[PDB]
Amino acid sequence: TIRQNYNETSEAGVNKQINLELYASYTYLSMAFYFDNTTVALPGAHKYFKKASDEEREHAMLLMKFQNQRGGTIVLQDIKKPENDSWGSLKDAVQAALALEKHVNQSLLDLHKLADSKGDAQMCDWIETHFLTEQVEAIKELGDHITQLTRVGHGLGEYTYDKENLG
Amino acid sequence: TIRQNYNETSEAGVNKQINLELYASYTYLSMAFYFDNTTVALPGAHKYFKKASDEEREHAMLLMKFQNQRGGTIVLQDIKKPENDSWGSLKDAVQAALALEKHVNQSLLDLHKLADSKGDAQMCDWIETHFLTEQVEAIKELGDHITQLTRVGHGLGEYTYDKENLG
Amino acid sequence: TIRQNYNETSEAGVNKQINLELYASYTYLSMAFYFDNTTVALPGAHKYFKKASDEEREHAMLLMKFQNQRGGTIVLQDIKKPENDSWGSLKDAVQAALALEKHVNQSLLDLHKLADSKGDAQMCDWIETHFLTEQVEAIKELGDHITQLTRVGHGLGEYTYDKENLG
Amino acid sequence: TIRQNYNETSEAGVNKQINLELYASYTYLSMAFYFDNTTVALPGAHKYFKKASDEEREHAMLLMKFQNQRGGTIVLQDIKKPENDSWGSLKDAVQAALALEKHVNQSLLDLHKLADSKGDAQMCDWIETHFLTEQVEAIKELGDHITQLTRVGHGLGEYTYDKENLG
Amino acid sequence: TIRQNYNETSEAGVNKQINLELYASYTYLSMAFYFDNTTVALPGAHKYFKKASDEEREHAMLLMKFQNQRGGTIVLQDIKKPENDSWGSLKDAVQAALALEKHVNQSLLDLHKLADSKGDAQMCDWIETHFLTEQVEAIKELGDHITQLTRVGHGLGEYTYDKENLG
Amino acid sequence: TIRQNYNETSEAGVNKQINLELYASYTYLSMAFYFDNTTVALPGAHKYFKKASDEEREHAMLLMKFQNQRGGTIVLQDIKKPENDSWGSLKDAVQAALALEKHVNQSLLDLHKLADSKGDAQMCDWIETHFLTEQVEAIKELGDHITQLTRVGHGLGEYTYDKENLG
Amino acid sequence: TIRQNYNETSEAGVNKQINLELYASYTYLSMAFYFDNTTVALPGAHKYFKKASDEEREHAMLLMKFQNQRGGTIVLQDIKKPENDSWGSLKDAVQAALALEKHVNQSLLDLHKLADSKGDAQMCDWIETHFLTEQVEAIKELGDHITQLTRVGHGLGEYTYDKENLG
């Protein structure tokens, strides 16, 4: 028995975060291949969101590793399809990514608060180490992208930012 | 308009195959982290199924790329959770992998047959090039693993094969 | 006598594809030096279409090699001059290239269907191997160029796409 | 059970091809050492036919591998001795090699047709990938050798072609 | 005329040895691909017997070379199919290889004795140089393999010896 | 006293062989400088026979070394001048070389037989090791040269073979 | 059972040669450390005979390997102490080594004759390959050493030959 100081509600919270990270990965994968569609044809955004999909899947596997490390049991659920089939302009998609990352951030903060309420000092630090600052940096990056995409405007500016910044 | 000689039924079969490859990726991910659970503790199998999960996800993205190349539209669905939460012995899991890969193979053969019935010569060759021989090779490899896992037996043999062959 | 399983109608189809590939090469050569004219002065497009002209001539020589390999006889015809003397905007020329490549694709698919109706298994696979996927990729690329050229607009955007993408 | 979409008549056809490839290997071995006989003494042809014998044995082993990959059973038969004990002039031998490769080509085309009639998409593609174009190229090469051997004539020409081309 | 001190019964004996070496090569090929069958799945034995098949074919070609060197005439016969279609356990197969190599050894000793009775000093030395010690060493190696296969036992031991020693 | 199991008749046969190897060396030297005469002017043959002369002289010194190793006494005789002053065509000379090498071979076989009749096991193996297979190989090479020189014919062929093969 | 064409008297002869080679090794070891004694102090001879002792032990192990290779049974006997405790002058010791090597040579020739009388063609060639010429060369070398040691004389010459030749 390796389980120690690991509450069953914390364990359920981890399984729930695993699903949410997979959901984000699937959403960024949808975004990536939307921008690869010939009627959209923004290759920098295709690369940017494909990499984001890879990273979210890595986040899910980190949480699965943690579940096993602490002596919990991974329980998987359906990965719901993304909210949209097509994602509009480049700015629209980055705005949707900002909304999603803020939703993931709030879910991570609630998980941290739950672990903390149960005295799980190692879990709290683990969440801080691998997730909380990474989320803050991703959110700041997405916000900057939105401000710049507003600045460059439609048409030539969207092509330029796609190629020079996202790609 | 880039679409040419690409039938709407073939397009729907590609969207179906995308979902099935993702379902396989999720099943192998479940298997991989089952073998990482401390009550199982087979590290070679963890590595082997994690890599299979990566590959199936790559198969899904190849089909997504093909959907776009031919002028179709990707439509994603929920990725159903895997059939089991735990996978038994190493041989049980390899047997479950074999059954899944044969299900995937029949789905690909059916997709090929449909494309062929619509005169889609490029789609048929594409499926042959990227999937049909790869599937034959994976099934032969899984069959051989099952025969060897029967030969080495329970206990020390399972440890040895996990470490010396799968890992 | 090396000729085996090679129908006289297949042979005539190959001679006809040889002429069409040469016609495409001549058309891209016209496009390339139109963009080199001082009243147009788009050097990226000059390079892009010069390379496309080289590749179409390579396609014709592949078919001539195949004709000889199967024991047919090459019969050449006049290479008709291109449909236009000047090609308009950059987007107009890429649209004309998309139309031409789709016409070449349909001609290749008809050639494949003819060979298949005569049981010429090697010819069908040869056409798949060297032409059918290459055509699909060229058509997707041209479509993406058109979507991007629409996005960047007239003037500065056409200069930019010419230099940063086509060149 | 790995066997899937693999018809028993296809399996018997593969076993027949294995014997024919081994028969071809044995014939080229006979040719090779005929040319090593001191009353013949053509060292370039010795090397050329010895290599052809090696390759035909590789073809046999590819088909044995394929038989196992698809879940069939290899059944071997006698390898019949070659049709002749001595092979005449260099041109005579290359002419006999051409006749044999066309016989093997027809056998491969009949095997492909049989597989296609049973809907074995992977087998057809495997035969195309490993044998059909390979066979077209070998027949063209043998045809060209016969034309050149006719051109160079008896005596000095035969010595020269043996040394400068076959060797 | 290069023939010197080369008896016609020696020449017929060399032709007989050529067929026996080719028969041995064919038997080891059968063994090799029996072990590649998915119901057997012993990859080390596949590689070990494939190499033995190559070497026996080299032995055949050495004797063909010798026949030509001495001014004899090579006369080939059918290569009879191997005695079995399947070869049992790894130990069974190595035991059958030992029986075959002892049969080949006795044939070589009878060939040496025949040559010696005709005063063919060079032939006797050639057989000693290329075959007799080579054969003693192969028999000793096969004997040691059988003893070790008995020692390691069924199951895990067979897997281990196949992988660590034969492979 | 080092002499052991070395019969006086074997010793006299070694002294006889020493003289015959020297006679061969002198014959090939004559041939070599015949082909260097300006009325013949075949430089490849000059090089080829000069090297054969060097080798035969090395054979004589090996036998001299062996005479001393076994405790015999070297006794030298006149080296008789070669049978001819001029050697005709390139084929004539190679034919004369073949006859001489077969005479040398019979002399070596007779020497082996004598040693064997005296129980000199080491001398027999020594003759086998240094001479009997070397002689078989030289005779086969000379036979092949004669066959090729017949194939290439007079004039241009003789020039070509001299330069491309002998030189 | 690996034993084939290996007579029980041959086997007994091999066991007997094993003992004789060990006896020679022990004798050269005695010689080597005699010359290392401070009242003798010939360091070149110490090295020379130490190496000879190593080689004779290697000869014994070759014969033990051969016994096992042919399926005999090694049976060891006492290694008798050397005939002398001290070996006189340097020339006296080399004379004793010559006598011993001639005794070993005669024993090897008798072993060869016995094997030959039983038709053991491989054994005869093995003895020739590893022993008979090596013995002839060692005997010639020892004889030369004795002639030179006579030439250089007592005192300074013995010191010089010891250092410049044996060491």
Author numbering:
A (entry chain B), B (entry chain H), C (entry chain B), D (entry chain A), E (entry chain A), F (entry chain H), ...: 3 to 169
Which statements did the authors publish about this structure?
Ferritin is the main iron storage protein in most living organisms, playing a key role in iron homeostasis and detoxification. Canonical ferritin is composed of 24 subunits, which self-assemble into a quasi-spherical nanocage with an outer diameter of ~12 nm and an interior diameter of ~8 nm. Ferritin has prominent octahedral 4-3-2 symmetry, and each ferritin molecule contains 24 C3–C4 interfaces, 12 C2 interfaces, 8 C3 interfaces, and 6 C4 interfaces, which provide several potential pathways for metal ions and small organic molecules to diffuse into its inner cavity. Thereafter, we introduced a self-assembling strategy by designing π–π stacking interactions at the shared protein interfaces involved in two different kinds of 3D protein nanocage superlattices, which is referred to as key protein interface redesign (KPIR).
Upon analysis of the crystal structure of AfFer, we deemed Pro156 an ideal position for anchoring the His motif, because the side chain of Pro156 located on the exterior of the C4 interface that protrudes on the outside surface of the protein cage. Subsequently, Pro156 was replaced with His, termed P156HAfFer. Upon screening the solution conditions, similar platelet-like crystals were formed with P156HAfFer at the low concentration (2.0 µM), which is six-fold lower than that required for the growth of above crystals, in a solution containing 10–20% alcohol and 200 mM MgCl2 at pH 8.0, suggestive of a self-assembly process. On the basis of the peak positions of the 1D SAXS curves, the unit cell parameters were derived as a = b = 11.98 nm and c = 20.74 nm, confirming that the protein nanocages are assembled in a BCT pattern. To elucidate the protein assembly behavior at the atomic level, we obtained P156HAfFer flaky crystals and solved its crystal structure at a 2.10 Å resolution. As expected, the P156HAfFer nanocages were arranged in a BCT fashion in the crystals. The designed His motifs of P156HAfFer form four pairs of π–π stacking forces in a face-to-face configuration along at the C4 interfaces, whereas the inherent Pro156 residues in native AfFer stabilize the BCT arrangement through weak van der Waals forces. The crystal structure revealed that the imidazole ring distance of the pairing His–His is 4.01 Å or 3.74 Å. Collectively, these findings demonstrate that P156HAfFer nanocages have the ability to self-assemble into a BCT lattice in both solution and crystals through the designed His-mediated π–π stacking interactions at the C4 interfaces.
